[PDB]
């Protein structure tokens, strides 16, 4: 009975909430694959750009508010790092909390956002040496793709996660192992 609702919160059929964000990033697994492959997406950009087609979507979406808060977060993110999780100050919440990723372009898992920048920085050479596709032009794409890879409200993951565990179980110190452990 698990239901993601259009709020993206996981809810058991009665409405009882389970998770607020599916993966916590609410990223659809079947669409998650090439997301972290930036170098591939860097190539073919002119193709993907035609597939996602950012043009039409500017109207219906808030591009900015997420991006502001994001950059607002990442600054202070790198600020307090080395301190442990408990001493770490909670001042702002992660991006996806205050911002629906579907309505808001740029609202993105802090993880992906980091991989993107880390990539986009160290590989920023390629943006110059190549045709010159602008980082922003590319950044704006991945964020769009990221937002387009979101889970769909009203699927069945409860079944998925069941089958997702169920099927591979059929595939197969001295601690307890295998299905017996899993059963356990």
């Amino acid at each position: 009975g698990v239901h993601v609702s259009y709020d993206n919160s996981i809810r058991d059929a009665d409405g009882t909430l389970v998770q607020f964000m599916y993966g916590g990033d609410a990223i659809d697994i079947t669409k998650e694959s090439h997301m972290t492959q930036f170098e591939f997406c860097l190539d073919n950009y002119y193709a993907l750009l035609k597939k996602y087609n950012p043009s039409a979507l500017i109207e219906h979406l808030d591009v900015e508010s997420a991006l502001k808060y994001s950059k607002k977060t990442l600054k202070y993110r790198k600020k307090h790092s080395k301190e442990p999780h408990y001493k770490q100050s909670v001042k702002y919440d992660p991006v996806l909390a205050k911002y629906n990723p579907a309505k808001y372009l740029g609202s993105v898992s802090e993880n992906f956002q980091d991989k993107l920048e880390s990539f986009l920085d160290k590989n920023s050479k390629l943006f110059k040496s190549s045709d010159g596709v602008n980082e922003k032009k590319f950044r704006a794409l991945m964020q769009l793709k990221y937002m387009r890879s979101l889970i769909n409200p009203g699927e069945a993951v409860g079944i998925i996660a069941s089958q997702s565990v169920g099927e591979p179980s059929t595939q197969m110190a001295n601690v307890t192992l295998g299905i017996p452990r899993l059963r356990e």
Binding site: I29, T30, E32, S33, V157, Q163, S164, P168
Partner: protein, 49 residues
């Protein structure tokens, strides 16, 4: 399926093409097998002309 509602889904939701990927690991479940692999080798091989 006996009605357009049903077959609407069977076309647009549960599908071969619509499902190219595990929900589990997100990995391709579909692709040519056996012969077709061994063929591609002898085809894509340089000795092919």
């Amino acid at each position: 399926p006996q009605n357009e509602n049903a077959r609407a889904e069977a076309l647009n939701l549960a599908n071969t093409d619509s499902q190219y990927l595990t929900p589990t690991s997100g990995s391709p479940v579909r692709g040519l097998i056996q012969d077709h692999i061994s063929a591609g080798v002898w085809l894509t091989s340089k000795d092919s002309f």
